[PDB]
Ligand binder design. Sequence first.
Ligand SMILES: C=C(C)CCOP(=O)(O)OP(=O)(O)O
Ligand code: SF4
Length: 309
Amino acid sequence: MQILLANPRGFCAGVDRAISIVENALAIYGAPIYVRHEVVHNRYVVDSLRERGAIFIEQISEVPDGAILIFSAHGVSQAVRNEAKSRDLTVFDATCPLVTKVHMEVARASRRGEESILIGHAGHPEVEGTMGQYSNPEGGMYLVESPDDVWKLTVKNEEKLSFMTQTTLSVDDTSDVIDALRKRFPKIVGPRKDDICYATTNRQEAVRALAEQAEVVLVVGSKNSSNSNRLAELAQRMGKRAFLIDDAKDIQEEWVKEVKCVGVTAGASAPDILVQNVVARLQQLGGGEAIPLEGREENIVFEVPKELR
Ligand SMILES: C=C(C)CCOP(=O)(O)OP(=O)(O)O
Ligand code: SF4
């Protein structure tokens, strides 16, 4: 059995920065350090941080007075940011710069009383934080997930309309939704394409190339990781068996029995050590040396705030 490794895969610049923010805060101020929601959607990463002294909570209420709080990489609504500022809490924002960029555009549209439409998945923290940057009752902030949602959306003034998107969506599906928005609201304005980040675009492109070579694709990443799910979904749509797994232990023999070529990739929040262990498991299951595919070079790095260096 041949083992192929997608490239790029794993940690993106935003994730690496968010994790370093928590680690450095812990090294500078010692434990405990409170973090609102998982800093990134990866069970292993979160566990490792708890070991170092981090405490993940869901609501600011859970955070004691005088404690250090860190916002997750997915970002937060203005309400949350205010709720933390109205408290005696020291805050460090690990929101990825690429998410913040979308945040700004929303707040901007909100100040100009112009309605905005976000393409994203309801309930995801990034969606909650981005929708949460709009607060002008004279305009509006609407969420759409598919062309169908677009087909039934009604706006106050489509003459002044703009759209934004979640950073981890399916490049293909988003394209379909944007096409619908333009046919519905011909005057709508937005980015040249979308707000899907380079890491998301690159990992989908890479898993596509992997899928055309492997019969089975294993995607390392947690169930709640939006970008990771998009990778498995893409593989599955190409007709290949694809599984989203947190670690080597989830691998079931039947998935790779008599399989000549298995591909492995990882979401933007999955550490390389998890991929290494998956490769080791595949090797005892008959796999040979893992062969890395040729791929897009990524060179962007996001530094932690100077205050935490
Ligand atoms: C911080 C963002 C947006 C993405 C990176 O990883 P994640 O796995 O942590 O979270 P999602 O893809 O679910 O957004
Ligand atoms: S996946 Fe994209 S937007 Fe989300 S943390 Fe990584 S680089 Fe930032």
